[PDB]
């Protein structure tokens, strides 16, 4: 889609979020903002850069 | 540095010289595979989302 990923009002994430929710990739290599709710979306490791 | 900041608010005679050299983090130590860790994770995420 060209995004990190954006949840719909109905809840439909796009981007690498629902890519790793539909498991179509193995990872998401992107400078991702680790949000409060993206952890609820998918598990995180530690941030490489803060 | 947080000890130094704890010093400085009652010690106006000295001054802090420059910023942090490195990025080092204090975290809460839970047991291996303890089930409430993600509760703590979402809790700190919403709590500093509440700052």
Swiss-Prot record, chain B:
**Tissue specificity field:** Expressed in the olfactory bulb (at protein level). Expressed in the deep cortical layers, dentate gyrus, reticular thalamic nucleus, mammillary bodies, pons, and cerebellum of the adult.
Q: What does this protein do?
A: Ionotropic glutamate receptor that functions as a cation-permeable ligand-gated ion channel, gated by L-glutamate and the glutamatergic agonist kainic acid. Binding of the excitatory neurotransmitter L-glutamate induces a conformation change, leading to the opening of the cation channel, and thereby converts the chemical signal to an electrical impulse. The receptor then desensitizes rapidly and enters a transient inactive state, characterized by the presence of bound agonist.
User: Which stretch of the full sequence is covered here?
Assistant: 740 to 790 of 919
Where does this protein reside within or beyond the cell?
Cell membrane; Postsynaptic cell membrane
> What species is this protein from?
Rattus norvegicus (Rat)
- What protein name is recorded for this chain? Glutamate receptor ionotropic, kainate 3
Q: How does the record describe its quaternary structure?
A: Homotetramer, and heterotetramer with GRIK4 or GRIK5. Can form functional heteromeric receptors with GRIK2. Interacts with PRKCABP. Interacts with NETO2.
Family, as annotated: Belongs to the glutamate-gated ion channel (TC 1.A.10.1) family. GRIK3 subfamily.
Positions glycosylated per UniProt: 13
Record note on modification? Mass spectrometry data suggest the protein is N-glycosylated at five distinct sites.
Which gene is transcribed and translated to give this protein? Answer: Grik3
What remark does the entry add? The postsynaptic actions of Glu are mediated by a variety of receptors that are named according to their selective agonists. This receptor binds domoate > kainate >> L-glutamate = quisqualate >> AMPA = NMDA.
